[PDB]
Amino acid sequence: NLNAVRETMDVLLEISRILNTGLDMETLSICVRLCEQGINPEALSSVIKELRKATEALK
Amino acid sequence: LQQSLELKRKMLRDKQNKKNSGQHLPIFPAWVYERPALIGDFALPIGTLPLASQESAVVEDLLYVLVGVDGRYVSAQPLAGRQSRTFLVDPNLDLSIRELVHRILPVAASYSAVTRFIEEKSSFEYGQVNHALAAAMRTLVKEHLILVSQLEQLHRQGLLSLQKLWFYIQPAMRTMDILASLATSVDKGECLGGSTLSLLHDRSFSYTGDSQAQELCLYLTKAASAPYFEVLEKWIYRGIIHDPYSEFMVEEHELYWDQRYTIVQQQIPSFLQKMADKILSTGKYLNVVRECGHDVTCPVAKEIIYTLKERAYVEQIEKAFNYASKVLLDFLMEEKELVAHLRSIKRYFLMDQGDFFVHFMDLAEEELRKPVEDITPPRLEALLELALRMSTANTDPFKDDLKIDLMPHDLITQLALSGLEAFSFDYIVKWPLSLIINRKALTRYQMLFRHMFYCKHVERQLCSVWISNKAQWFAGAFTLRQRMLNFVQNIQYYMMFEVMEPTWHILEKNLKSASNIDDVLGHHTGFLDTCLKDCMLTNPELLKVFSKLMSVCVMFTNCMQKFTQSMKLLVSGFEATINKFDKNFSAHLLDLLARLSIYSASVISRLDFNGFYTERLERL
Amino acid sequence: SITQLFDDLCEALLPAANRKRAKRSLKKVAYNALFTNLFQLPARNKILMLSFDLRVGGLGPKADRLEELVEELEAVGSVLDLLVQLAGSGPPRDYFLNNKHVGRNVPYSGYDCDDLSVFEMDVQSLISREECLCHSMIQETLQVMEAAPGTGLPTVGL
Helix, strand or coil: CCCHHHHHHHHHHHHHHCCCCCCCHHHHHHHHHHHHHCCCHHHHHHHHHHHHHHHHHHC | CCHHHHHHHHHHHHHHHHCCCCCCCCCCCHHHHHCCCCCCCCCCCCCCCCHHHHHHHHHHHHHHHCCCCCCCCEEECCCCCCCCCCEEECCCCCHHHHHHHHHHHHHHHHHHHHHHHHCCCCCCCCCCCHHHHCCCCHHHHHHHHHHHHHHHHHHHCCCCCHHHHHHHCCCCCCCHHHHHHHHHHHCCCCCCCHHHHHHHHHCCCCCCCCCCCHHHHHHHHHHHHHHHHHHHHHHCCCCCCCCCCCCCCEEECCCCCCCCEEECCCCCCHHHCCCHHHHHHHHHHHHHHHHCCCCCCCCCCCCCCCCCCCCCCCCHHHHHHHHHHHHHHHHHHHCCCCHHHHHHHHCCCCCCCCHHHHHHHHHCHHHHHCECCCCCHHHHHHHHHHHHHHCCCCCCHHHHHCEEECCCCCCCCCCCCECHHHCEEECCCCHHHHCCCCHHHHHHHHHHHHHHHHHHHHHHHHHHHHHHHCCCCCCCCCCHHHHHHHHHHHHHHHHHHHHHHHHHHHHHHHHHHCCCHHHHHHHHHHHHHHHHHHCCCCCCCCCHHHHHHHHHHHHHHHHCCCCHHHCCCCCCHHHHHHHHHHHHHHHHHHHHHHHHHHCCCHHHHHHCCCCCCCCCCCCC | CHHHHHHHHHHHHCCCCCCCCHHHHHHHHHHHCCCHHHHCCCCHHHHHHHHHHHHHCCCHHHHHHHHHHHHHHCCCHHHHHHHCCCCCCCCCCCCCCCCCCCCCCCCCCCCCCCCCCCCCHHHHHHHHHCCHHHHHHHHHHHHHHCCCCCCCCHHHHC
8 A cells, every 4th residue: 555655645746736726745745644634624724824824924 | 365375275284184084175266366356355636626526526435445446536555464454545635534534444444354254265175164154244245235336326416425424334334343353353363163153152242232243243153053053963863974174073083982083172162062072972872883783863853053142952962862872772781782791791700600610620620730831721621611511501692702811920910820820711792892891891800700719719628628537536627727717708708798799789770770871881880890999909018918818728728738648548747837827827817807997897797706706916 | 643733734834044932823823713614516526617717718738637637546535625725826849739740640631820829929928927037136126226225224223
């Protein structure tokens, strides 16, 4: 399975790039590990945008 | 600056001879040095003009003087062997303006001793620390030229005179002066590695009450600490160093486990000077455990950034100190064991067997009686391997380390002769445990074995003559023998059940409570030195009373008797020598007892159990 | 814990250059927005609905690739469900279309003048982009060369 979940991790990258999401490789790994727990992703979509707003609040 | 070529040559050669970790570092091209136009620093009569034309002319040339550009009614005189630029104003300048110009001239003077560092003192010969100093002093000089251009644009619109310039340059001589002070002290005197970082922990403490210049000094040393932090981000977490620029306190030596990595005194920054001993140790443990086949990485690791007078960055260093010396200890005690190794030392040097030695003593008695170089070493190795396998001891796998060792001495190998007093052991140790136990400990264990051998040896001599007489109704020898026998068995009770076995037992608990290699080295040296001192060896005379007591014991049992010289086994001539030996023996016994009493216990306390020959005469 | 992965989300999205008090406030920001939605159709169908607007805006092979990957990822369901909700707020020759000189038995359609004209626009967008860089490099520096002195540098504050 360890063969399969590296290749599915690589194909998972392209559809996150072409859908124009804010994710790069690192944040993609954080988010795939976070969804693996069982969290609803429609909730995660708001906390990522609130972090990216309040990050710009400092600078 | 003419000095710089000599500096580069001397620096490069000095780096190269110490270690060959990197040679022939690049010397920057010759046309860089030959042009003074790659370095930031290299008319009409003013006397009859109107006053305002004079102020407008001088502010115009002064803005050129702030950079390396020739003025319209002023020039820059050549420097000398001197550092900062002086300038040459036009005759008949106004006496009002001349004083004000010398208030504005310190900006150009504090610009002269800035670019000469940046445009030369950054190269590989100078270390890898003059780099980043000229990599955050360059941004400030860029800012200087920015300010000069922004001033010139206002000058073109008729909107600059000497007074506006005078207001403008107070930010440029409260800030550029700090640089022109730091630069001519870092440059003068070799400041490489930690010495710079101590000078910038001295000149960031020089401003703590100004608050204008303090942030600036912190900015300069926060860029100069970054390459040092780069080297500190290997050594603490791996054993790996390359570093041919010798900017670090630890130096790679091209030659083991203590002769490779060594602290250098002038390569220590001031704010880690207290922590300098921990750095080398924590780094060294990771490399030496990979020398004995193990991992080198420290999986607790973070990145390091400087703060003036606050600590969070000498903190993660302690967390790798809480890994390195505790992964090496846990490596040693359970892998390539020090517990079974120490027990296999215990088995013979502390003579843990009584069986193996009485087998040995019976098998080798004839050869032990003969002097040295009247002995047969290949026969004795065979007899030792026999007597070992007959006994209890066959279970440890380190029994093979024993070889035949001759030390013909009478303890003149201090920390002809007979075979009994020329028998020792040489024990082979492994490379991981060689780090702690070495030639000194092995020598002390050998000397302890030598002292214990005589006490073991005289017992066989007593028991042989004791059984050989049993004739059955005789008591002439049976009095001297009984007195000596009680003594030589109580010395043997005192020494092991007091001097050796309890503290060996304590040491095997104390090593499990150690946390550093230094800790184990403390406990082991305590036991080995003090217990050997506890047994009767220490005096300047080395306690000859003990040896002469043993001498008259052996002389009584074998040298004078030979088991009544096989007379039946006369005039009671043999009983008179018993009497003479007995008087000498009383003298020696009292000498040893009084010597142990007078030096500030238990062997006297149990030998004299109820007033048993405790008074015949007493000193003073 | 799961609440610890939210600290690592704050770690990636804010790099370090203070910087020990901002991260706890951002951790509060990460916690405070998660539970407001929790108090108050298949997955690949939305992918088709988004490939449609691509094809409306031209750019055929991108839609043909987006449909190519979900077809083999069904031949991880909850992570693409995040990407459709993060869409459109992040950062974003060939001689076989209008060159009939290469191929093997090339298709016969007469000639072209109606996609060969949008083959210059393929370069015209690049030519219009690499001049906007030099408009935005002359502007950032004319904002420094022209000002009253020291209002872009804090050196007057020293």
